[PDB]
Amino acid sequence: KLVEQLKMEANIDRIKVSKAAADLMAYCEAHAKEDPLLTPVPASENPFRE
Amino acid sequence: AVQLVESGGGLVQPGGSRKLSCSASGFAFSSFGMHWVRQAPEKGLEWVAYISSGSGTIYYADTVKGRFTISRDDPKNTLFLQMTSLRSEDTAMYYCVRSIYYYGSSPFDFWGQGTTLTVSSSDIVMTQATSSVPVTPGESVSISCRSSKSLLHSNGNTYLYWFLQRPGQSPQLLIYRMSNLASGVPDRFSGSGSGTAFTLTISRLEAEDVGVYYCMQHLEYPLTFGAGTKLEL
Amino acid sequence: SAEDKAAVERSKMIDRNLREDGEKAAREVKLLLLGAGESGKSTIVKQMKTGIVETHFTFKDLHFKMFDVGAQRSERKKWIHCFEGVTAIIFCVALSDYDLVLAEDEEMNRMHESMKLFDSICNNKWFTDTSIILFLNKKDLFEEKIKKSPLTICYPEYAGSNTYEEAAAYIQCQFEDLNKRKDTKEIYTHFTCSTDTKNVQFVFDAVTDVIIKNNLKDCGLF
Amino acid sequence: XXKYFP
Amino acid sequence: VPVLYLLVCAAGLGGNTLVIYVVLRFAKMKTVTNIYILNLAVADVLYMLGLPFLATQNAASFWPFGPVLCRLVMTLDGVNQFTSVFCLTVMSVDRYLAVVHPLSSARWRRPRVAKLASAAAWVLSLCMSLPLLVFADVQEGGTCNASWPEPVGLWGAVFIIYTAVLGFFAPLLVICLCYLLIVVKVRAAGVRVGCVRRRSERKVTRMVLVVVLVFAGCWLPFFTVNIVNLAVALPQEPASAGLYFFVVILSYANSCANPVLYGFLSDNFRQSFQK
Amino acid sequence: ELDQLRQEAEQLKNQIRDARKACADATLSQITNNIDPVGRIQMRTRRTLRGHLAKIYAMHWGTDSRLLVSASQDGKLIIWDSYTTNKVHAIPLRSSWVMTCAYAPSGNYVACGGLDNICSIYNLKTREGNVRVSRELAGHTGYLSCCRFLDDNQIVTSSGDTTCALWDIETGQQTTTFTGHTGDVMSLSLAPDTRLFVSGACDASAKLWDVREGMCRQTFTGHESDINAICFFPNGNAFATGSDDATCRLFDLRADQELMTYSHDNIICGITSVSFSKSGRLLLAGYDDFNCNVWDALKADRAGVLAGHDNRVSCLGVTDDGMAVATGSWDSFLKIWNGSS
């Protein structure tokens, strides 16, 4: 009962990861320059210029 | 519950000395930097002295350098200011104002009630031609000041401090850093500007909002005040 | 700015007060308490005065800090490494629990469980160099418990002397030699008695010994 | 004497 | 003999540099023991730097015509010779603060205080080397030998006796045998109440006794000869010159054995010695 | 009865396993081939927030990406001005056994969580001159393992017991309790939308939950040992878990499959902490082998190392704007890294 009513609660939309890789494909541009780690940031905007 | 009350003021024979005691309660003064601000009658405010959190940094007024000394004591939780050789011009309204200095803090927030001192018988300069603007309550009021040099520090903080002095009361911080509202102040007050050009904006004027406005600079070691806009009935 | 200078002064004030607190904290000796059930961990937190009991029993110029943790009915893997820096581990074993098998678990006279616990405790990667105090919790009643039933169903290899000398010469040695790393760490042992202060004097001596040993490893001469 | 012969 | 002296000097310099690199260049700092080890290592390697200058003993005076003879070498060498023992004494002092009084160490020991004591030792280093630099008489005969260009019967003797005072009187006879107090206290109380096996005796002896013995043995002849010949002057024979040929090497023995024994043989720094 | 329940559970297990494997082919390695693989981050230590004197267990940044909170075994909680390495606040703690901590969305309550089983909340921007404890969230039996913040009044905490709970700070009572796990719940993360929160446990399984209701949305499995670090993807519909089995597994919120298992043969030690960069591309995991590590989420390759820590790196977090990363460690140093070029 306790596990019978909780062993299956994911019936929304079964989709393929290969088809859903568009998430990362578009995230490559969603955060392209905002994050300094992937895209080399200029040192002027760097707040940690030691 | 914050309560800064001053004592040790009144009439003193010329050439004497007096100690200005600021009693602090309702807050941890040990983590707060204490200032002393003067105010000549029918005139603007003026700086007496300042002590940093822990007494590791001190400053003094150019016109009171050496003559005035300021000493705090955290055990007893009170602040002292000893002055010697009281001149005739050393007659003004003295205010005790706290300030905590850390990132995003609120310096010059709570001002004391103040005590008066009377006697018997380079730096930043203010250029304010207007000092009395009769404005009727109800509509927008725009106050502005002038500064000698630029305010934008490499830290990005334009250290401009606005204050409102109510008739028969103590000054209150309206917008510290020229852009950020203080605590316990209605949102109708506003202030914005770029470097030397800035202004203070109020959407609506209340009956209690009457009072003389003031501007303060904190970029350099001296904190020069000035005679700001005064609002009449 | 004058603001940033005051912020830096405040940060230096925090540095000073915080270093003072850390140097004071350093003087506090820590003792993780790991006796089993029915092991008189109580007799120890009582006469020397949810989740845990950080008993501060600083008594002889030593800032003692005994963490009695027996209320955590949870896996010990992910909170025992928090005691990496600790002077000694005060383990408690009930000697009288040498013939009482677990009613539900059907254990081996409630001793192989204690032996497994001691092996697990004395051989963690986080307790290689941490000394262990061992307390014979119920030695006083073990003399009576051995007069009617002996130590033969569990360990027939024991010699037998009909006295507590046999107890010291049968199971205490087994607990001592169970220490795999006999060089890095020392296993102090004591009989948990009703003495007013010996039960804590042995602890204090073990702390002072581990302390000196650690100081010898601090000035780069050990 | 010193670091040499006397 | 010059080849052996050069090899010994190079080995000592390399060992001290390795000790400094493991302590300072490996970021293994901000500990008073590490700071003291770094100071002693620097003092010993800098002291070593003067040995190759005196390694070529082919003529009376060295090839430099003054700028090196008494201006720099015979001043820095003496200063370092004093400051190395001045770091050994504070090493024993720090040992006493750690093992014996751990209840006030960090109150009386901080990286700031360690740097303060290091600078104090390095500044008392030139206090005795000032006569070796200001009162230095550039001698056309010999490499360099100053004492006082004036009355050496008293001035040179006073310098030598005060050198002995600053090299053996306090720093050995007090600090270096303060090490024995640690082993005495351990043998008396640390083990007797706690356990039965004397596992805390042999290892600590094979540290304290060996340090005391090596330092005294390789550091005593240099001053015993300088005191014996002060009154009973040693006659000039090739035997005396040959004896003095290796005595300086044995004086260097202290500064080449200190980096390996004082801060490298113990496992605490041996753990970080690798990589 | 019991046999019937076991049969139903086995039948349900087959259905969910087949559904997870029914995602077409989905050869991750074959299809995940893009032209932006991080070669070497080589982040240098821009600042060293020295001052902690014990193992550092948790660090959390601020909404402003400038103030960060840090918790260590010394019973100290420090708010650093990472911009200029200044200690804005130093809150002493009643319990020196913090295992996790956080910053309120208003960065005004930096409540942490420890083995005393209570999150004591600390008011930052108070009228008084000191930071004081406001309310303690008592009612947990196990050790608090991830104590987070939804808003100024809502906090959800993970405990040692196999149950998580959502609280009301004003009243101090659990408005909800989430009890679906079986073993020691070790970590818990909040999605950006603050509608679902995913928590991992020692049962080698992670489960989402609904904050409003109190029912687990769905479960995920696959780890061979106990989880000790979980974090939400910036997208909000994904998360990666760091277990003691020396691997990191990425699980989508909807799909029950594993995107990638980040591990290497040379590492025989588990992951202690996990955080994410604002790009959803730089998974930084604090391993037990005395140095942090930087994993990309696409190629599942070690695209960076942060070998600046003397002892085991125990916590790390990335700013809200991706500006920095403050990896704390058992060597008591918070190294704030920023890439330079």
Short mmCIF file of C-alpha atoms in Angstrom, two decimals, chain C residues 54-178:
data_model
loop_
_atom_site.label_atom_id
_atom_site.label_comp_id
_atom_site.label_asym_id
_atom_site.label_seq_id
_atom_site.Cartn_x
_atom_site.Cartn_y
_atom_site.Cartn_z
CA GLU C 54 28.32 17.97 24.29
CA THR C 55 29.09 17.71 27.99
CA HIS C 56 31.67 20.26 29.12
CA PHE C 57 33.24 18.75 32.25
CA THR C 58 36.41 20.87 32.38
CA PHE C 59 37.72 20.01 35.83
CA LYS C 60 41.55 20.19 36.11
CA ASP C 61 42.73 23.01 33.92
CA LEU C 62 41.83 21.12 30.86
CA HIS C 63 39.01 22.32 28.66
CA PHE C 64 37.32 18.94 28.41
CA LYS C 65 34.58 18.41 25.85
CA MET C 66 32.94 14.96 25.84
CA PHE C 67 30.55 14.41 22.93
CA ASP C 68 28.18 11.71 24.17
CA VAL C 69 26.36 10.62 21.02
CA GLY C 70 24.07 7.63 21.41
CA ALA C 71 20.77 9.21 20.39
CA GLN C 72 21.70 9.14 16.68
CA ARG C 73 19.98 5.95 15.51
CA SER C 74 21.51 6.55 12.09
CA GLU C 75 24.44 5.45 9.96
CA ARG C 76 27.77 6.23 11.63
CA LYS C 77 29.72 6.55 8.37
CA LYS C 78 28.79 10.17 7.61
CA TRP C 79 29.20 11.78 11.02
CA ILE C 80 32.19 9.99 12.56
CA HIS C 81 34.63 11.76 10.23
CA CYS C 82 33.55 15.00 11.89
CA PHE C 83 35.63 13.79 14.85
CA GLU C 84 38.91 13.43 12.92
CA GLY C 85 40.51 16.02 15.14
CA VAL C 86 39.94 14.51 18.57
CA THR C 87 42.34 13.69 21.39
CA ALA C 88 40.97 10.24 22.20
CA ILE C 89 37.90 8.06 21.71
CA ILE C 90 36.29 6.88 24.95
CA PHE C 91 34.89 3.43 24.12
CA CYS C 92 32.77 1.66 26.73
CA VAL C 93 32.17 -2.10 26.81
CA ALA C 94 30.05 -3.91 29.40
CA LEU C 95 32.04 -6.83 30.80
CA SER C 96 28.93 -8.43 32.30
CA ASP C 97 27.45 -8.53 28.78
CA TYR C 98 29.54 -11.62 28.03
CA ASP C 99 26.82 -14.26 28.49
CA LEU C 100 23.60 -12.38 27.61
CA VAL C 101 22.69 -13.14 24.00
CA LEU C 102 20.40 -10.72 22.20
CA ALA C 103 16.80 -11.94 22.38
CA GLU C 104 15.84 -10.68 18.92
CA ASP C 105 19.16 -10.53 17.06
CA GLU C 106 20.38 -13.87 18.50
CA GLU C 107 23.87 -12.41 18.82
CA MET C 108 26.98 -14.10 20.24
CA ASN C 109 26.73 -13.29 23.96
CA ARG C 110 26.63 -9.54 23.19
CA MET C 111 30.40 -9.54 22.72
CA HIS C 112 31.07 -10.24 19.04
CA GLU C 113 28.89 -7.20 18.37
CA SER C 114 31.10 -5.19 20.73
CA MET C 115 34.22 -6.72 19.16
CA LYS C 116 32.97 -5.80 15.69
CA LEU C 117 32.24 -2.26 16.90
CA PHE C 118 35.74 -1.97 18.37
CA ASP C 119 37.29 -3.26 15.14
CA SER C 120 35.24 -0.79 13.09
CA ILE C 121 36.18 2.09 15.41
CA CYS C 122 39.88 1.31 15.84
CA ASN C 123 40.51 0.86 12.10
CA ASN C 124 38.77 3.78 10.36
CA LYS C 125 40.84 5.86 7.98
CA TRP C 126 39.86 8.80 10.22
CA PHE C 127 41.10 7.12 13.43
CA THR C 128 44.52 5.78 12.44
CA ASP C 129 46.46 8.01 14.87
CA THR C 130 43.66 8.66 17.39
CA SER C 131 44.19 6.93 20.71
CA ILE C 132 41.33 4.93 22.21
CA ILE C 133 40.45 4.65 25.88
CA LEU C 134 38.58 1.44 26.73
CA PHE C 135 36.29 1.22 29.77
CA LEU C 136 35.31 -2.14 31.25
CA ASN C 137 31.83 -0.88 32.11
CA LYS C 138 30.43 -3.77 34.15
CA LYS C 139 33.55 -5.35 35.65
CA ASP C 140 32.15 -5.11 39.19
CA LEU C 141 29.16 -7.34 38.39
CA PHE C 142 31.25 -9.61 36.16
CA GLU C 143 32.73 -11.34 39.21
CA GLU C 144 29.22 -12.43 40.22
CA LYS C 145 28.27 -13.14 36.59
CA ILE C 146 31.25 -15.52 36.24
CA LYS C 147 30.64 -17.44 39.49
CA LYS C 148 27.48 -19.09 38.13
CA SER C 149 28.24 -19.32 34.37
CA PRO C 150 31.69 -19.35 32.79
CA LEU C 151 33.32 -18.11 29.59
CA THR C 152 33.25 -21.37 27.66
CA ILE C 153 30.27 -21.41 25.28
CA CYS C 154 31.72 -18.34 23.56
CA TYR C 155 35.51 -18.80 23.91
CA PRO C 156 36.47 -22.37 24.89
CA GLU C 157 40.12 -21.39 24.27
CA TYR C 158 40.17 -19.39 27.53
CA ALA C 159 42.35 -20.86 30.27
CA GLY C 160 40.12 -20.25 33.29
CA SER C 161 40.96 -18.97 36.77
CA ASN C 162 37.51 -18.59 38.44
CA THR C 163 38.37 -14.94 39.20
CA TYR C 164 38.50 -11.59 37.43
CA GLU C 165 42.13 -12.38 36.60
CA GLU C 166 40.67 -14.77 34.02
CA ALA C 167 38.50 -11.94 32.68
CA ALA C 168 41.56 -9.71 32.37
CA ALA C 169 43.54 -12.56 30.77
CA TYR C 170 40.85 -13.75 28.33
CA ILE C 171 38.88 -10.87 26.77
CA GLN C 172 40.92 -7.78 27.69
CA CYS C 173 43.90 -9.17 25.80
CA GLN C 174 41.59 -9.94 22.87
CA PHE C 175 40.47 -6.30 22.86
CA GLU C 176 44.07 -5.05 23.06
CA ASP C 177 45.49 -7.18 20.25
CA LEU C 178 42.52 -6.33 18.01
#
